[model samples]
Target: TTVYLAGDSTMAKNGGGSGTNGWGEYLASYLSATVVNDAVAGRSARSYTREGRFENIADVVTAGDYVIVEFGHNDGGSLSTDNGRTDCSGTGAEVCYSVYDGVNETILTFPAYLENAAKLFTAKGAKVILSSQTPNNPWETGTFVNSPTRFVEYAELAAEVAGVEYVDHWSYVDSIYETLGNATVNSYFPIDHTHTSPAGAEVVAEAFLKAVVCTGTSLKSVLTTTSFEGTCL
Candidate 1:
């Protein structure tokens, strides 16, 4: 079975900027399955869906495949002034009026988009996991903001609604930043507050894989990445 990633810049490899990288690209090193890291840059749940990224994966996945969905960074902001990436603010089957650069469009909440993704992949018999996005530079303000955004709650409810798993990537990465200290964690945010350097990508990938092994999901059984041994395995 393959492992597909549907997410935004935080999970896209080098998609954030020239010097930035997302963690999804590093996932291939920790799993035996084919890692299809299709996460794009600057995308929200609404935009990613409209772009047909989720449907692209759903079309290829088979029974027992895995799809990890992560989004939030671009999901913020008003859909009225939409960058074509803003999700409507709600976690249920709600809708909003959106104006995407002079054209009118219907906006779906974060959970609404995720629920669509979950249903799409699940119908193909893929195991779905709604993951919280990795934390931004917690020490960027010269202090730590290790707290998770409401997206964490939204992702949890989305997963619960879809009957899938929800991984706390935000918390997992937040603790790492806390331990690394202020000036030290500064090394990872080479480009901006939200994106991470390549080094940061590996650590975030390690963090997520650590959770995977520790959590004992069915996906854990296919582990072939040996480097994660000293960390979690």
Candidate 2:
């Protein structure tokens, strides 16, 4: 079995051996299965599918495999004005149009892109895990910001609509960040609020592994010797 990851830079191998490290870079160390981290930087649900990144996994994943679909960091913005990364608004079959690069294009809603990928994977008998996007250092502002997360909600709904397993990756990692408090969490995000340093990537990786255990995703069966206990479960 193989575990495939589909998401944005928060989950990608950004800058390869650079200061920024995504949690995806650490997944293989904990899982027995082959890990395919196809997360690209600066992508949304719209662009991921548009660029055939999601289909790259869909085309090759097989039975008893697992695919985790995550997005949202670059998902919001006016489709016309944004940097070609905006997903259409809503959770259903709604559509939004934009003119980018001198061409008109119609885009699917965020959940629709997720749904398309989940359906394609599940149809091939792969377990689909629709994961919410990771946090953006809420503590960076000096106070714990309990910000509203409509994108997080959309990820949950996308999983529900696809009838697949789901992971609240953002909440789990944010809880860890809260426990560590603002000062330390800020250190983990030295360059920016969105990306993590290498150490920070490992922390986020631990949270994902624990969440799989806590939520009983079938993917947990393939995990190796993961040390972090999920007492939160």
Candidate 3:
């Protein structure tokens, strides 16, 4: 069985011996199933769908495979035809947007796109797990900045609408940041707050694994290790 990942840069696959790494690349260490890191560096759910990235996965993935869906980093990009990638609201209605792929584009809200992804994967007979985007490393007076709460809400809403499991990586990482304090957490994010260094990617991967295990989802059966644990289920 394969566990396919589809998302943005944070979960994207990285290069050989690169200091920067996406959590999905590191995620394989803890999973026994074949891990396919098909996450793109700057693609959003809309762009991924429009570009037929998911279609590529659907063609190969068989029944009983697992698919992890996470996005939102680039979903807030420009909607101009030149930009190609576009921003979307969390509202359900589809809106007329800029030109894309040689035609006028229609965009779905973030939540709606997520739901669309879940349904698409489910139709392929794959178990779908909706993951909130990983949190960034910024911190305020006492709170973490770059909180992905809005994305988290959209993920949860999508999971509910699609009848799938939601992994709250945003909240899980928030707890880790608080426990580690600013100094240590700050070290994990040297390249601005949005992206993570190699070390930071490991932490994000761990948090993601813990979230999956605690949820008691079917993924646990395929996990290679139960070394990490989280409070929330």
Candidate 4:
């Protein structure tokens, strides 16, 4: 089974340096050799799919194969890269995007790529798994922080609408921070506000596996096992 991991630099193999290795690299250790991490550095879902790069990989993936999709950290950035420009500038603002709302400055939506890509892979009989964005250094001044996470919510909503499996990384990451205490927020991320260090990556990877990969159950069903009140399973 060929498993394709597609996402941004945070999820790509950026090597072990100060750049903060992507979580996908740690995921590679969990799965066998059949898994193919197609994540690239400095790439957004928009650029990856629009450029036909993801399509080229999707073409080879078939039924029983899985494609874990995650894109939000980079998707929420304001820098202008090959993918696209950020909708609004500044941190802790009301910045948002739209594909139908028609009010967004970027005029592009990462969900558009995620939604379409999931559908495309599912059509080919591949199992599309939606992985949410790993939480960042949201806690500031010992208060509950609201890091930019609109894209993650959008991704979860898209997955729900498409009836695909949704891996709640935001939930896990939030839990990690809360469980680790506010002092440990910096432990995950060194200098950058987005990516995490090798040790940090391991911590997040354990959370990922515990929440989704470990149980070997559908993500939708995994929610039901949790004590969190919700209609799962």
Q: TM-scores of all models?
A: 0.93, 0.95, 0.89, 0.75
lDDT of 4 by residue, 168-223 (tens): 77776667666677767776677766777777776766676666744354532323
| Number of clashes found in candidate 2 | 0
Q: Residue-wise lDDT of candidate 2 within 124-188, one digit each (tens)?
A: 99999999988898898898886646889999998999999999888888777877888888988
For residue 12, model 2's alpha carbon misses the true position, in angstroms, by: 0.7
Candidate 2 Cα outliers beyond 4 Å, as residue runs:
15-18
Candidate 1: deviation at residue 110, Å?
Answer: 0.2
Could you tell me the TM-score of candidate 4?
0.75
Better of 2 and 4 by lDDT: 2
lDDT of residue 11 for candidate 2: 87
**What local lDDT does model 1 show for residue 186?**
90
Model 2 clashing residue pairs (backbone):
none
For model 2, give the 10-residue run with minimal summed lDDT: 224-233
Q: Report the poorest 10 consecutive residues by lDDT, candidate 1.
A: 224-233
Model 2 C-alpha RMSD to native = 1.6
Cα lDDT of all candidates, in order?
Answer: 0.83, 0.85, 0.78, 0.66
Across residues 101-157, which tens digit of lDDT does each residue of candidate 1 receive?
676788889998998899988887899988888888899989888677888889989
- Clash count for candidate 4 is 0
